[PDB]
């Protein structure tokens, strides 16, 4: 909300109408115009509405009703021509003679609340005394609405005095247009959009106050970044004086609650001209005012009564006793004006935008002044806004504006506030927009936004105004011309792109893996990188497990989940638990996403200068500083792998299903994979395979550990797989198979091995002995029993032999089979079964 800008349409119309009398547009048209030039309209709030007798009244008599736990008043109100009405009200912020807005019976308040003559507290009640909220005028504050004295006569129309036909616009101003944080800037933009003559409400001719001498001793440290500091006092005001209704109403509609005229004029001028103002008590300043950096551990209590731990970079305002204000953020309670203050010293200062931004973010004080100083404030209007503010205070609360003025404008004193001139070709906006603008369009638009434009051949020299520090390069001037002419006039031309090379191998493989797993029944999960709390403790991982070395987020949305995932399984298992808890108990989920794995080389890199390309070493240290972020593929399974139906009872998920998901990924990656026994949490130590591509480990698969499943609340028998895709080398095979048409010989061999000999090792030994005649080998039987003997198992393979150039004989195939059996005997101790 730091970019917000609330202001009523009646105030905008007034400033625009000075240069263009009679200018008035519907709220719908105004919204579209602001959008067409780049101002986001977040909300359009109309006031009221009000129907029936809603009349300004005068509190004539107040009789306190005693006996209740709450103070209740029976009031008589003059609604005009001394025609009195009895009103029962529970508020206390009013006395006899105050102006109040009463809703008589028959009236209608927002929204739809019809007033009726009722009897409350045993007394007559011919209506109610309305509050600011009940009238849809101001924010919900305590008490009823009390108009300032002389605002209207008793009997005046409520909607007319309150200006309920007005419309309030809530704008979200982009941070490059700080000048639009005021009625001045937005009224100027409307004059640009409607091609109107604009009268700046901050100009000198709109006369300056006299300058006889300094107003107060002032010493400014130049390193604080302050660009200007102005002080003019107003002596002898009436503390009992209040601000008129037009001023309090405009502050109210802009979100600022009025307090006293000394403070109201500082906020009113801030909203009107964009320059924040601060009011000090002249008789509460002790000695020379000083602008300096804070000391190590220096403290300061602002006007809200909160102690602030100051930084070395915070710019302060101090005198000889205590700190008066945190520069450009918030004033202190020291020189703060109160009901005791009669001498007011007004402050108009231009602070460094970066310094204010640092301080307000660190102290969490995004005040109305800090939001504007953050986005730069026009330094050429400091004294002008000071004189406007001083005359307004003296006109409201009386007094004499002292003809003294302090105006620190740097050392040496700065007398020109315009940014450097910009040289731009005359047709440059036309080239960027792709439109042949009419002659003079660029020069006229740049003059509307306040720039001096000289012409010399084909080159324009543009000097931006002091309130437009964002205009630094020709591209900035291009934006001003195009947004005012309207972006909708830009044509649509598709660029002829050069011949591209399409998708890379890795991008294509990510698609193939996704298609293959989805067709096999897996549902894709987009896994959150924020780990569940305590997940590695649930897994029982050792303290030195590399998965525990996580990158941490400082400001997570869930305070207990700041660690970024080093593995995809925690998110997938969390997604599995959600589905199962919702009644979907047979799930296969997968995910293709990167993980975050920091190393000891993971570190921060200071700012690299951005006015040139980073060197090759700077690119290398930026890349080497980031944690490793390899792409992983992972999946989890639970429940029935095959559903039940007319075919049978289905099949529960088993570890072999995870092993097949590995082979689904491997075939989609066109790589060969071996699976080897392994122990690696959270997998079951007896049902866990480590997956290798060549001799490189790429992940694990199998059934999860039953203790992990129990502690995690997972379904029993849950299986999982996780592979590192970046460790799987991209393969581009070009097969050239030669298919032998000659008949095949089918033979089976039955081999007894030790029970713990892996079946793949027996097949490899058979294949190695069979030679080139072996076309296919398939294990189809694994048998244990007393026929075989203890600690043994029998494996039976189906062998298909085939010659490439002849009809293979039964004997020649048996010779290859005998050699296969001999090879199995030598390598895994296989015994031919008899």
């Amino acid at each position: 909300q730091s970019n917000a800008m609330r202001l009523p349409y009646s105030w905008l119309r007034e400033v625009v109408a000075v240069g263009a009398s009679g200018w008035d547009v519907t709220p719908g048209e105004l919204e579209q115009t602001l959008l067409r030039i780049g101002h986001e309209v977040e909300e359009v709030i109309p006031l009221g509405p009000v129907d029936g007798p809603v009349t300004v009244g005068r509190v004539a008599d107040i009789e306190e009703l005693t006996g209740y736990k709450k103070p209740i008043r029976a009031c008589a109100v003059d609604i005009g021509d001394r025609q009195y009405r009895e009103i029962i009200c529970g508020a206390t912020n009013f006395a006899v003679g105050d102006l109040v807005v009463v809703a008589l019976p028959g009236a209608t308040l927002p929204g739809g609340f019809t007033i009726s003559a009722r009897k409350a507290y045993g007394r007559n009640s011919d209506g109610m005394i309305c509050s600011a909220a009940e009238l849809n005028l101001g924010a919900d504050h305590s008490g009823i609405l009390v108009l300032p004295p002389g605002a209207a006569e008793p009997g005046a129309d409520g909607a007319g005095v309150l200006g309920l036909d007005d419309v309030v616009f809530h704008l979200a101003i982009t941070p490059d247009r700080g000048y639009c944080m005021s009625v001045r800037g937005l009224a100027r933009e409307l004059a640009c959009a409607y091609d109107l003559d604009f009268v700046d409400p901050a100009s000198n001719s709109r006369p300056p106050l006299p300058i006889e001498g300094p107003a107060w001793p002032l010493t400014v440290q130049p390193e604080t970044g302050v660009r200007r500091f102005a002080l003019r006092p107003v002596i002898g005001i009436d503390p009992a004086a209040v601000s008129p209704w037009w001023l309090q109403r405009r502050l109210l509609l802009c979100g600022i609650r009025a307090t006293c005229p000394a403070v109201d004029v500082t906020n009113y001028v801030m909203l009107e001209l964009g320059h924040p103002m601060h009011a000090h008590d002249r008789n509460r300043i002790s000695g020379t005012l000083g602008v300096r950096f804070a000391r190590s551990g220096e403290t300061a209590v602002t006007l809200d009564g909160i102690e602030r731990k100051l930084d070395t970079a915070d710019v302060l305002i101090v005198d000889d006793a205590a700190t008066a204000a945190i520069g450009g953020v918030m004033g202190a309670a020291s020189t703060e004006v109160r009901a005791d203050s009669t001498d007011v010293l007004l402050e108009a200062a231009i602070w460094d935008p970066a310094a204010v931004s640092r301080t307000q973010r660190r102290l969490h004080l995004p005040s109305e002044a800090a939001r504007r100083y953050e986005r730069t404030v026009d330094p050429a209007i400091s004294v002008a806004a000071l004189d406007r503010c001083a005359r307004l205070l003296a006109d409201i609360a009386g007094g004499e504006v002292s003809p003294t003025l302090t105006d620190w404008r740097g050392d040496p004193p700065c007398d020109d506030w315009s940014p450097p001139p910009i040289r731009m070709g005359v047709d440059v906006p036309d080239r960027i927009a792709g439109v042949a603008y009419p002659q003079g369009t660029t020069a006229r638009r740049l003059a509307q936004i306040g720039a001096v434009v000289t012409h010399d051949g084909d080159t324009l020299t543009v000097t931006p105004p002091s309130w437009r520090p964002d205009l630094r390069q020709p591209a900035d001037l291009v934006e001003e011309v195009l947004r005012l002419e309207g972006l909708e006039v830009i044509p649509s031309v598709l660029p002829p792109a050069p011949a591209g090379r399409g998708l890379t191998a890795g991008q294509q493989r990510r698609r193939t893996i996704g298609r293959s797993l989805a067709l096999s029944g897996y549902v894709e999960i987009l896994p959150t990188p924020f780990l569940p709390a305590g997940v590695f403790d649930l897994w029982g991982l050792e303290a030195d497990d590399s998965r525990r070395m996580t990158t941490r987020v400082l400001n997570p949305l869930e305070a207990d989940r700041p660690q970024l995932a080093t593995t995809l399984l925690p998110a997938l298992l969390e997604a599995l638990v959600r589905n199962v808890s919702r009644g979907l108990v047979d799930v296969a989920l997968f995910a293709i996403a990167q993980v975050v794995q920091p190393t000891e080389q993971t570190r921060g890199v200071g700012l690299i200068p951005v006015d040139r390309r980073p060197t090759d070493d700077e690119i290398a240290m930026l890349d080497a500083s980031l944690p490793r972020q390899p792409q992983h593929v992972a999946a989890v399974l639970a429940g029935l792998r095959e559903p039940r139906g007319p075919w049978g009872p289905g099949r529960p998920v088993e570890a072999a299903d995870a092993f097949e998901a590995v082979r689904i990924i491997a075939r989609a990656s066109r790589v060969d994979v071996t699976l080897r026994p392994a122990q690696y949490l959270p997998w079951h130590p007896g049902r866990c395979a480590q997956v290798f591509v060549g001799e490189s480990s790429v992940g694990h698969a199998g059934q999860l550990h039953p203790a992990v499943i129990e502690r995690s609340g997972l379904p029993k028998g849950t299986c999982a797989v996780e592979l590192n895709l970046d460790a799987i080398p991209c393969s581009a095979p070009l097969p050239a198979p030669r298919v032998s048409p000659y008949p095949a010989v089918f033979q089976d061999v039955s081999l007894v091995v030790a029970a713990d000999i892996p079946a793949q090792a027996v097949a490899d030994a058979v294949r190695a002995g069979a030679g080139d005649l072996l076309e296919d080998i398939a294990l189809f039987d694994v048998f244990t029993g007393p026929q075989i003997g203890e600690h043994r198992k029998s494996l039976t393979f189906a062998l298909r032999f085939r010659a490439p150039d002849r009809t293979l004989t039964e004997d020649d195939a048996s010779a290859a089979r005998d050699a296969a059996v001999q090879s199995a005997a030598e390598r895994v101790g296989a015994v031919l079964r008899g």
């Binding site: 970019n3 067409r36 780049g38 982009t174 310094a355 931004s357 939001r371 960027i432 927009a433 792709g434 439109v435 591209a475 900035d476 947004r483 972006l487 830009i490 044509p491 031309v493 598709l494 660029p495 792109a497 050069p498 011949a499 591209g500 399409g502 890379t504 996704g514 298609r515 797993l517 989805a518 096999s520 894709e524 987009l526 959150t528 990188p529 990158t551 941490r552 987020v553 400082l554 400001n555 997570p556 949305l557 970024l564 997604a575 959600r578 589905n579 979907l584 996403a593 921060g604 890199v605 951005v610 006015d611 040139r612 390309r613 980073p614 980031l626 944690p627 972020q629 139906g645 007319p646």
Partner: protein
């Protein structure tokens, strides 16, 4: 009798829309660039002409990575891929980039903390806003159809000048049909080209960044993105296998 022993799965609709967007731009001669999800501040902000101590940077909904002096973060947008692409490739460049992005926004009907963006970047001789509008019109035409209502209006991004936002008329928007922001775009800022060693007098460029989930909501008329981010299998299966 039923016959499906192996029930069909489903790739995620967000990923399937990304494939459709990718195919759309590849068919126009463009290519796909990539970048990590954990990024330096150098490429996420500084090289994108973000000021140092200024609300244009501070108001960002940034996930900052520990420790406090790390200048690391979860990337708030895919725009750091602009920097990586201009450093790694010769000109001209016509790429898009589809990846995840992270902001501290609470889940509502159109915002989620972990979402995806479609970035676009074109740098060449003589490119203008008309080429940017031509590209966005093809993007919108291929995803929303020839009857789609879009509008472009000025905005601000540190890495574009001029800058714009593109809205889409969202009929199924909760509370009534309205214009809803689709993404940001503009002409690549000369400071960005300077930070990548490119002469802004010889090359110009445009870039855009649209929400992928936001595109899906407009395309399929999904008013509330909760289901597309919670990972219930009942949300994905009606979209098909996606093979």
């Amino acid at each position: 009798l039923p016959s499906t022993r192996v029930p069909a799965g489903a790739r995620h609709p967000i990923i399937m829309l990304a494939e459709h967007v990718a195919d759309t731009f590849i068919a126009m001669g463009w290519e796909l660039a990539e970048g990590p999800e954990v990024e330096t501040e150098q490429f996420n902000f500084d090289a994108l002409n973000f000021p140092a101590d200024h609300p244009a940077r501070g108001e960002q909904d940034t996930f900052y990575i520990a420790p406090e002096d790390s200048r690391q973060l979860l990337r708030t947008h895919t725009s750091p891929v602009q920097i990586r692409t201009l450093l790694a490739r010769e000109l001209p460049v016509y790429i898009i980039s589809i990846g995840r992005t992270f902001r501290t926004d609470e889940l509502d009907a159109t915002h989620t903390p972990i979402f995806h963006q479609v970035e676009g970047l074109a740098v060449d001789r003589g490119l203008s806003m008309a080429h940017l509008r031509g590209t966005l019109d093809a993007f919108a035409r291929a995803e929303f159809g020839p009857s789609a209502r879009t509008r472009i209006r000025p905005h601000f991004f540190p890495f574009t000048e001029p800058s714009a936002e593109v809205d889409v008329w969202f009929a199924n928007k909760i509370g009534g049909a309205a214009w809803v922001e689709w993404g940001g775009c503009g002409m690549v800022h000369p400071n960005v080209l300077r930070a990548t060693g490119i002469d802004p007098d010889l090359y110009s460029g445009f870039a855009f960044g649209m929400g992928l989930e936001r595109t899906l909501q407009f395309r399929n008329g999904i008013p509330d993105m909760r289901d597309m981010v919670e990972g219930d299998v009942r949300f994905s299966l009606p979209f098909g296998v996606g093979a």
